[PDB]
Design a protein that fits this description.
Chain lengths: 824, 824
């Protein structure tokens, strides 16, 4: 009935309905008879993109006129998730859009479910990046992100009888309605080739392969602001003229299209397998391609703002932030662009580069810092190796000529490790030496960087090193994912200003004992639990009881994350439930356990752990004697959407990594913000959460990070004494109770005292008893409903500090020296 | 200045200007700073596509409600050219769009020049297809075309010092604003695999590769009607799930993506080189892909129109027309879809197939009819070979049962040639045996098919064979490419109804001697010649004199087309001009010779001819003693756009193929319609043109088709006597006058009496003298300006018969049994 009428600025139900129908008809991607939910999604998204374009454009023009110092965030991952709910929310158009879609015959919820997540990231590195973008927008900061437009993500995880199987993502196999292609924004990116030395001493990278980098903008709208910034993504492309027709017409199709194939490879998947030289080269190509395209674009915008400019202004007008060591090549690439393409001398280009770049480190373990073969780097990126060797020459000369106390450490401090067997470039060393600031992501992590990992560098530059505690946006992670709870918070604080000033949540503490609030709290959590139930049934086929305790663990599958401990706990609780009399079973607290996460495909034990969880669920969930008191579900394809479904409905979440292994952990912060209590080790963000929410609202257990090496040494000296419940759990897994899959090889990782891959290095067995004791505390606290709801309210009430708004403001002031630039 | 305001139905300058700016802003493909000619082009096209969508939709719905019999035209080529001018013209929005672009700061002409031709075809087969689509739309016929969405055409021709070089077309490297993707219209297409026999006797093609066939519609608007039909184009695609991640992550990138690569190959170029087994298989895959995707879509639309349907209705509701033998596989594919996917028995599916399919043949030479190795067919399309062998078994049984006088000819009449040395499938035989109608494309061609090529088949089915003389649309080829001449015609006929009733042009004959008309005619031709001069200067750098005689030959470069005869004529003319006294040179008619066309890349002598034309021009054009009387220019990258520039400005065109070699030739018709006289052999469309325009208005020469074999035999018997002027032309080319390129090997094709590639089989030497005598007649006729202009007017006046509207109306009534279905 509703007729097409374009209105790019539609802000009421009737105008918005007209604009959606306009796109359906005049921006078609389907046959015109079809107006199903999927077609309704694309039309709605295109209706919203109209407003996004207006704002993006206004923002671009304003930043152009003002010529503020601008920050560019370089990341190999962005976990954008779905864009619909967030776009509608930040434009504060919820009611009008929900009403428009109703007049067109749909519930907004159903349409929202059609959207595929943007497969542009994998883990916490990427979701941090995504949260940061939302906060940069909302704080009106002149800042952008750059990334790669990956076609297939890491992988879509499916769960079969074999356990995890890995299939390419398909989010772009029709189209993304959010992105805007910029066919004028193309930069050449080189690979391989060699260095031409000119008579005047200048140098030029020549020959090799040249790919085209094409820009796509993804608009990022701020909450309660016109300010709309960009996640500018690159697509690697060959030109038509790069296809060799002679070869094609001889039947040599692969040779004919070899440039197109190498360009496609760059944006196929994140973290392509790098056991072989091909893979190592591919990963390096992706990092270089990000770096080179992004820096060419940045330099081009710097010049475009010239009202007449001097290169001395560059580090007063540009900040480049490296998320982890993946964008390390920005350092030598910026030197290359300055000196070769722009004529600067080494000293002037170094002064610019060292004042522009900053490095954020996300790791405790020095073994985990990136290193590349010097031969591979010479092959792919000869001119950059020239620049890197010069950076290292100068640095080492300075240590030799000023720090004689460090002479014996030059072999570890240098960027180039000239080990006779496997000479490498130490990318973290390149980052620390070159960057004006280096930061960690939690206080303890940052102290560990200063005191252990980079101590000799701290000695050289005692003001280089800073902390910036991670955070999460309360838009995506509370306001938009839990609207009913958000309405309760607004009502009781008598303001909605908490959405941009999350510290206002402490105003809930005075009401934590108030039974009317506890009632409304409980109703909210229950609603979310029924929605979650529905979802889990939909996607795993298992019915789950929403009056049961929802216990959730969702992280990357990995021995140090200790999913294996959780699952052995479940196996023990199952066994005891089975042995109990039915009269005794009625005393226990019913529980639905939910584990999810992806396993790196080639990581054998991680894949065995996923298989184990599923085999355990298959048995427990189908056992009519205890399945009223316990169910276990492996939740597949964990991504932002899945987190948006689980987090609002969560009651207990598990953050149980071996102490000392986690720098941070932002999912912890999401769960705490949503009233979900944590069972956790004293590690990463758990430390700060427990501080802010109060130790009485947190379930702590396990060895502490300083005990861990002592306890490993006790194991090696044969002094470990396994708890009987742990031994019984193990045996039961080895009993055959969970089918014909031999779990013996997985569990052998927990056996013995010595050997790589043996001796329970992650202290599954040692922590097990305090872990089970904590789970007993959870049960007892759960049975006291009023006490539970009080703890849940305090958890939300104490979450203010974890806002990514706080984090980004600190970066803005202390590292980038940028400020708000609100679009009028 | 002008503000964005969407108006899909914009019909005046101000509304249209707003809609263009609306697309520029809200359908962006560029950074928002840029509004150059290219960006203007895209925005203007999108503005027009708005109107095209409305009409396409209205048309689709109307055909759906009516359930008329509908024709589907299958072609491996469409020469669509540029769409802008044609779209504006058919919507009769010329004035409003030219004014809109002027208010936005542009001339429509400049915007028009930004458009890349759709590289979807190569030659006359494809432009015929494109003309037919325009006439289907204009005559309100329920008819569509199906084609492949080729990414890179055949090739873009560049001319370098080496002559022709071939580069991939790039029309899709940003996007095409005309097409509409239909993500719900996807069909599976199989290759290789094997045939499963089921216990119930049914058979199923299984295994092998499976690609996805995705539809894109290109709207084809009719002149003076709402009726807008489709050229539906297929893209071959792999699914994301077809990428093998294990292999990708092992560094085996080619293996990982091998399905994606085989899908991409299908739509890379037209006519991929087929000397090797790979290429033969790729060409077959392209034909099968077209056929299978198209027929699945047709069957799906047949069912979608059901009001309740019976299969007996299918051939009353569907006609499939095969343009040449490339869609031969529609016959067995339609039997496969009917019997396997839809459950029909052989006899019912054959009755349906034989009444649905018809075949248009375009060939005089039996050596030219497509044949494929039986083994290759078995490998790629096993189920189709099963069906083909059954068709052939039954047909041969029919000859035994009913036409025992043909028993001895079964080995030539059968579809399967079981020659022990080279067993093949004869695709033409399959087409003739299966189709209810077979037609040729000119009266003489059709008589040759009945009397020689398929005589025994005519004997079996004496009503199968028909003629349908080709034609051209007077919209693209007169009304839109020559607006000024069109305005003169309208003024003198006192009507513009000729645009859809081209036989009205005979009303110009009474005026062919009228001095005022001749004056206006000349003025019109002169304006077109100056535009052509500009263009030639732009695209070759050669400055040409528009008061000279413009002599044009534009066809595929080939020894039988006899560009080599033309160029040797030019070389002789140049030599005589140089030898003349300047007093004598002033007696001659100045001439600009223009040759163009593409050479197949591996066809050595064709490429040598392109080089020769360029080397001759380089010398003549830069010779200040005769370049006032002669210039020669090779016009590069001949395509629809180039013909749109040359044809309106042409005075003489050359259609000089060896007699008996051409079935038709539509470019002949386009020239005749535009008042350009023809120097030509008695062959192809020249026969009918000369009849219609009058023998006094045509320059005929050369051997006739009945003489050709006798003359070839005389050459073999050593009785040929070369004309001295021919010999002198040859020698001068061998003199070194045209640079260091040795033309000896090229000319060796004209030497000797026997040998493949030798002995002047195309009668260049024999026809040369009557050719030079005709060119002499042209010069004399040119000097009599009134007599020339009378002949030019008579040429246009007699061109009515060559309308594609006549051609399609005949197909509609006599072959498809479809009728007008005007959209209200
Ligand atoms: O302003 C001085 C100078 O700076 C730049 O030269 C640097 C090169 O760009 C860089 O490769 C490196 O040069 C070394 C070569 O790699 C090596 O092969 C050998 O020749 O030693 C060189 C010096 O150590 O370092 C220099 C400068 O230190 C810029 O390219 C010059 O144009 C510019 O004049
Ligand atoms: O008419 C009913 C019957 O028709 C269809 O069968 C045909 C097959 O589809 C077709 O291939 C061909 O089959 C021959 C096989 O190719 C070959 O192996 C040979 O040895 O024997 C077969 C029979 O000639 O011909 C038959 C029809 O003559 C349809 O698929 C059947 O299900 C249906 O029963
Ligand atoms: C927040 C989030 C993460 C990061 O969580 P960690 O605690 O570091 O494991 C990862 N994936 C998704 C989908 C997230 O939403
Ligand atoms: C009309 C046309 C053709 C068909 O020409 P023939 O005379 O059949 O060779 C080929 N190419 C182009 C660009 C045309 O416009």
């Amino acid at each position: 009935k509703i007729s097409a009428k374009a209105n790019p600025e539609a802000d009421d139900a009737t105008e918005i309905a007209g604009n959606i129908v306009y796109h359906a008809k005049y921006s078609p991607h389907f046959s015109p008879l079809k107006f199903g939910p999927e077609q309704a999604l694309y039309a709605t998204a295109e209706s919203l993109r109209d407003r996004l374009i207006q704002l993006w454009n206004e923002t671009y023009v304003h930043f152009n006129k003002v010529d503020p110092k601008q920050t560019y965030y370089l990341s190999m991952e962005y976990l954008q998730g779905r864009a619909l709910t967030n776009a509608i929310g930040n434009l504060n158009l919820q009611g009008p859009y929900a009403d428009a879609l109703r007049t067109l015959g749909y519930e907004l919820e159903e349409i929202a479910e059609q959207e595929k997540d943007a497969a542009l990231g994998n883990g916490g590195l990427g979701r941090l990046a995504s949260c940061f973008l939302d906060s940069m927008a909302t704080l009106n900061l002149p800042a952008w992100g750059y990334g790669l437009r990956y076609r297939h993500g890491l992988f879509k995880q499916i769960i079969t009888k074999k356990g995890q199987e890995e299939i390419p993502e398909d989010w772009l196999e029709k189209f993304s309605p959010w992105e805007i292609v910029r066919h004028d924004v193309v930069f050449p990116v080189r690979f391989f080739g060699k260095v031409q030395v000119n008579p005047d001493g200048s140098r030029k990278w020549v020959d090799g392969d040249v790919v085209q980098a094409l820009a796509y903008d993804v608009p990022i709208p701020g909450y309660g602001t016109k300010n709309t910034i960009s996640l500018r993504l690159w697509e690697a492309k060959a030109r038509a003229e790069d296809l060799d027709l002679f070869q094609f017409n001889e039947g040599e199709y692969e040779l004919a299209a070899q440039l197109h194939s190498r360009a496609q490879q760059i944006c196929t998947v994140l973290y392509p397998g790098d056991a072989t030289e091909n893979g190592k080269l591919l990963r390096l190509k992706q990092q270089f391609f990000l770096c080179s395209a992004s820096l060419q674009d940045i330099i081009s915008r710097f010049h475009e703002r010239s009202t007449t400019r001097k290169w001395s202004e560059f580090p007063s007008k540009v900040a480049v932030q490296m998320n982890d060591t993946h964008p390390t090549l920005a350092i030598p690439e910026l030197m290359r662009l300055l000196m070769d393409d722009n004529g600067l001398g080494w000293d002037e280009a170094w002064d610019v580069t060292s004042k522009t770049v900053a490095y954020t480190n996300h790791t405790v373990l020095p073994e985990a810092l990136e290193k590349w073969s010097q031969s591979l780097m010479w092959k792919l990126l000869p001119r950059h190796m020239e620049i890197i060797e010069e950076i290292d020459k100068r640095f080492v000369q300075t240590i030799r000529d000023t720090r004689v106390d460090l002479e014996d450490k030059i072999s570890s401090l240098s960027i180039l490790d000239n080990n006779p067997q496997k000479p490498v470039v130490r990318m973290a060393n390149l980052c620390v030496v070159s960057s004006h600031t280096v930061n960690g992501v939690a206080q303890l992590h940052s102290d560990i960087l200063k005191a252990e990992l980079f101590a000799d560098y701290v000695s050289i530059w005692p003001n280089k090193f800073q902390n910036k505690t991670n955070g999460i946006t309360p838009r995506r992670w509370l306001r938009f994912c839990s609207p009913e709870l958000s309405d309760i918070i607004t009502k009781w604080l008598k303001t909605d200003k908490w959405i941009t000033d999350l510290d206002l949540l402490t105003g809930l503490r005075q009401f934590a004992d108030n039974e009317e609030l506890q009632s409304e709290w409980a109703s909210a959590k229950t609603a979310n639990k029924k929605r979650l139930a529905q979802y889990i049934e939909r996607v795993t086929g298992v019915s789950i009881d929403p009056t049961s305790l929802f216990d959730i663990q969702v992280k990357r599958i990995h021995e140090y994350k200790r999913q294996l401990m959780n699952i052995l706990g479940v196996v023990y609780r199952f066994k005891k439930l089975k042995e109990m009399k039915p009269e005794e079973r009625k005393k226990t607290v019913p529980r639905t356990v939910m584990i999810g996460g992806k396993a790196f495909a080639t990581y054998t034990n991680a894949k065995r752990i996923v298989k184990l969880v599923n085999d355990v669920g298959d048995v427990v969930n189908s056992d009519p004697e205890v399945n009223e008191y316990l169910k276990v579900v492996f939740v597949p394809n964990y991504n932002v959407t899945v987190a948006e479904m689980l987090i609002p409905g969560s009651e207990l979440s598990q953050h149980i990594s071996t102490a000392g292994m986690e720098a941070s952990g932002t999912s912890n912060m999401k769960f705490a913000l949503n009233g979900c209590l944590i069972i956790g080790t004293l590690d990463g963000a758990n430390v700060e959460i427990r501080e802010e929410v109060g130790e009485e609202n947190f379930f702590l257990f396990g060895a502490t990070a300083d005990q861990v090496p002592r306890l490993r040494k006790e194991r090696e000296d044969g002094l470990f004494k396994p708890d009987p419940r742990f031994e019984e759990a193990k045996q039961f897994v080895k009993s055959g109770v969970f089918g014909s899959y031999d779990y013996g090889p997985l569990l052998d990782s927990l056996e013995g005292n010595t050997g790589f891959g043996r001796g329970d290095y992650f202290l599954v067995g040692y922590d097990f008893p305090s872990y089970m004791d904590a789970q007993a505390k959870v049960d007892e606290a759960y049975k006291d409903r009023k006490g539970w709801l009080k703890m849940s309210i305090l958890s939300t009430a104490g979450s203010g500090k974890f806002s990514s708004d706080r984090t980004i403001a600190q970066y803005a002031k202390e590292i980038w020296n940028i400020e708000a630039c609100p679009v009028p």
